Design a binder for this molecule. Structure first.
Ligand SMILES: NC(=O)c1ccc[n+]([C@@H]2O[C@H](COP(=O)([O-])OP(=O)(O)OC[C@H]3O[C@@H](n4cnc5c(N)ncnc54)[C@H](O)[C@@H]3O)[C@@H](O)[C@H]2O)c1
Ligand SMILES: NC(=O)c1ccc[n+]([C@@H]2O[C@H](COP(=O)([O-])OP(=O)(O)OC[C@H]3O[C@@H](n4cnc5c(N)ncnc54)[C@H](O)[C@@H]3O)[C@@H](O)[C@H]2O)c1
Lengths: 487, 487
């Protein structure tokens, strides 16, 4: 439905009339045309935000909170309208859009609604006679850039904290999946959000994206994307030394020890990499199995893989859908051919679906490939339904395999040994680690990377901190200075 | 005195024999020759640090704490030895090195010594049957770069937090003022700090400094310097997306209202800009006086300015010394000539004093210049004993003046009106604001900039947070999720 820029509370076309095609991943069909934002457009969106900020941040915190709260209830009223718009644009089964994407986007906004007035300053114990209080205040206009894997969920992950804190926002979704988030802004002002407090500006990365990260009135830039692109954001920020949050990606590891609950681990590991058609940043795209249970696991796992109802996203009975862009699909498939050239033994799937109906879309089937570590495809992020299997025999060997990546966003492990579980989670260099479960998120629990998967967290009290400055104020009440320059 | 690199617990020469002259700002005399660190040298210092990290962070926190605590006591034992070494190298009057520089360096280390085992993780309220605890862990190798205005104090400001947190350090002081901090590392290992846990690598900005910010094993780079140089640090960090802390400087404002206590304000304002020969970032290099008290203030202020015992840093009766480098002296003086070309009326000092002994050192005398805002010298940081005076008539005009800068790091204001004091401190865009006092710091009270004076704080619980990652661990104890892919 909606498809234009949203600047200062009005849906407007791109200043230079720019346009971008938004396609359905299921049949290649055109869904609609997006107003394509360019430098001149963001200049406006940011100016709109800059203008709206003083009044917005001047609102009592409780008020910003109440609006977020209503937005959350409102998103649930339009539960189906949204789940449908999203799954259509991204290829997410409605199985997911209805039960995950939407409720978790609302739950997140609700969290931060209840958060806005619980952000407290502090009073520092200090020299006698002085009073040092430190206020925690909004940074200013905040620029946010997201990818296209959870377009809907990201709106809550990203704007949720920034808004509660009192910041004013300019957000550029994925030229590939803007539709979802455009409806959200409408829902915002429907619920009472002042004009200009939020501004959506879909557009190419090197136009909208770059113009945004470079902008001189933008006080912080919050980016979720690839390591490659993260560097172009860092470069951009040097213009006015704006703060940065980097949510780059990772090759999440998924270890299964000898004493694991094979059934639960197969189901977890399958949900881990295959849910959301493998386009999860936290996706366990590296399996790591103990020798003694490796065979027994793959028997049950591969079976499960081949029996996955893959098809039309709009089918309530569809378990897995297509990749969200034609490009990627391509990419992935080349990553598969590559894994074979290095001696990979493809154990399930491996190419596009046989079906005539299926090949109108960017589909690829559940792929599992046996390999060695230090292989090219066990290092670089294959952003698809693609799992590599390796085997280990000692705890220490498993840790070594899990840490031999330049990526450390997420990882998990399956055991029933008290010591082993905690020892491992402590040793693995990763921003988060799941035991006997996987891909569990929750607003309030810090979500972010470590090292080359970036800095800054989303979700928690941590998230709020990232969107807030510290004004320190000293008041001399009862302490009398003795002149430094003694008369 | 002590003059070589310090890498892996040994004083060593630069790998390529490089050398740098360290001069006394009082007479131009040579003090000694510093081993000049270059790329190859930091490669070692960082490797030493990377190696020492595992063991160091593995120590119980309380242990790291105890060492910091002893280092603080030890620094006070060598109180004079250091105050003397510092004031000699920097031109800081001893009266200042003895009573300020040294005790505040110890105090800060002592703070963070008591802090190391009070850094707590958190346990998140989460879905029933799960247990989500979030540990707060060290980053790894931390690189720190400092300027030359408080060489001694910075060692505590910077390494204090980083070490307590469990990080391992590689620090590049100011080629111009390395001596002070070299002694400190010796003191560290004297007190029991493992070899490699701290590494000092004095050297040129574009050799040591650049190689350090670019290094791929460095997990965070903490920089204190100029806005100009800050951008080169941001560029460098794109190599491995290392975290950044920036403390670029600022043109601190110092407002005096009609109802001020004008004696106390003259003494504060004088201490503000002239203490430490004006080479304070937080230095009030912009006076702002109400019409009704402007004249009366300057009468008392200018008198005080001209009556400032300016001379030999080693004289216990010296009130103000030289600038720490010949290049600054020269820049500065040019900034003075500039203020005149724009119609500035120099009210006190204005050129190099013309004394005998002082004709050899990089001296400049207390300068006060009447001007208008928007003038070139009221915008750019004159890093010297240099105050510009402007006048205002309404509160609102004063705020406008104080905010018309790119910089936002130091502000102060003098009033006795409850409302005015708080309203103002809340409106001024600055990371910290002092009322009826100035340049008051304290470990525990966050010290940092806002906007183009950078991000990140030193000195507080905040400071600890900037030197620490968040590992989130999920444990499934009583969870029986339906398999996502329903059989
Ligand atoms: N850390 C997390 O929580 C998290 C969550 C979801 C996805 N991801 C990561 O997202 C990635 C997928 O997205 P991608 O393949 O399109 O990478 P990408 O960096 O090219 O695209 C991401 C977004 O940034 C914008 N962009 C592209 N180039 C830009 C530029 N030069 N300047 C400014 N902005 C620009 C795009 O328009 C887009 O919407 C993965 O590698 C994955 O791991 C991370
Ligand atoms: N915000 C604060 O807490 C704070 C505290 C003290 C000083 N300051 C600011 O610091 C300034 C003084 O420093 P400056 O005039 O010598 O400029 P500067 O930034 O060049 O010098 C400071 C340090 O930066 C390092 N450095 C320089 N060039 C580098 C490069 N190309 N790559 C990596 N590292 C490099 C140097 O080797 C040096 O020791 C002031 O303007 C002042 O207000 C800010």
């Amino acid at each position: 439905m909606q498809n234009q820029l949203y600047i200062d509370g009005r849906f407007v076309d791109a200043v230079a009339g720019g346009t971008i095609d938004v396609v359905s991943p299921h049949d290649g069909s055109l869904i609609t045309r997006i107003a394509a934002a360019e430098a001149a457009d963001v200049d406006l969106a940011v100016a709109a935000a800059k203008r709206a900020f003083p009044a917005w941040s001047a609102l009592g915190a409780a008020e910003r909170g109440r609006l977020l709260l209503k937005l959350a209830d409102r998103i649930e009223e339009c539960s189906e309208e949204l789940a449908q718009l999203e799954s259509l644009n991204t290829g997410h089964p409605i199985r997911d859009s209805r039960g995950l994407d939407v409720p978790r986007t609302a739950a997140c906004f609700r969290y931060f609604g209840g958060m806005a007035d619980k952000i407290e300053g502090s009073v520092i114990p200090v020299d006698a006679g002085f009073l040092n209080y430190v206020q925690r205040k909004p940074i200013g206009v905040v620029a946010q850039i997201v990818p296209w894997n959870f377009p809907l969920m990201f709106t809550s992950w990203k704007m949720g904290p920034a808004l509660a804190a009192g910041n004013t926002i300019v957000i550029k979704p994925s030229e590939i999946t803007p539709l979802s988030t455009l409806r959200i802004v409408e829902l915002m002002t429907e619920v009472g959000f002042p004009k200009g407090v939020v501004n959506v500006v879909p557009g190419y990365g090197h136009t909208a994206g770059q113009a945004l990260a470079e902008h001189l009135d933008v006080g912080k830039i919050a980016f979720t994307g690839s390591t490659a692109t993260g560097r172009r954001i860092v470069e951009a920020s040097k213009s006015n030394l704006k703060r940065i949050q980097l949510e780059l990606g990772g090759k999440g590891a998924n270890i299964v020890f000898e004493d694991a609950n094979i059934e639960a681990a197969v189901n977890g590991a399958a949900w881990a990499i295959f849910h959301n058609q493998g386009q999860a940043c936290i996706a366990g795209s590296r399996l790591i199995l103990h020798k003694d249970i490796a065979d027994q696991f793959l028997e049950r796992f591969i079976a499960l893989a081949k029996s996955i109802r893959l098809g039309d996203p709009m089918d309530p009975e569809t378990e897995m859908g297509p990749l969200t862009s034609a490009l990627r699909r391509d990419r992935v498939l080349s990553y598969i051919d590559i894994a074979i050239e290095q001696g990979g033994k493809v154990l399930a799937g491996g190419k596009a679906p046989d079906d005539k109906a299926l090949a109108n879309g960017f589909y690829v089937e559940p792929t599992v490939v046996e390999a060695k570590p230090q292989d090219r495809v066990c290092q670089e992020e294959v952003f698809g339904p693609f799992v590599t299997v390796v085997r280990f025999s000692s705890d220490e060997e498993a840790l070594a395999i899990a840490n031999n990546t330049e990526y450390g966003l997420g990882s998990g492990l399956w055991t029933q040994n008290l010591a082993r579980a905690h020892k491992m989670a402590h040793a693995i260099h990763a921003g988060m680690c799941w035991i006997n479960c996987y891909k569990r998120v929750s607003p309030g629990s810090p979500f972010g990377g470590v090292g080359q998967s970036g800095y800054g967290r989303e979700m928690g009290f941590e998230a709020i901190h990232d969107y807030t400055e510290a004004r320190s104020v000293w008041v001399n009440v009862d302490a009398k200075i003795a002149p430094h320059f003694k008369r």
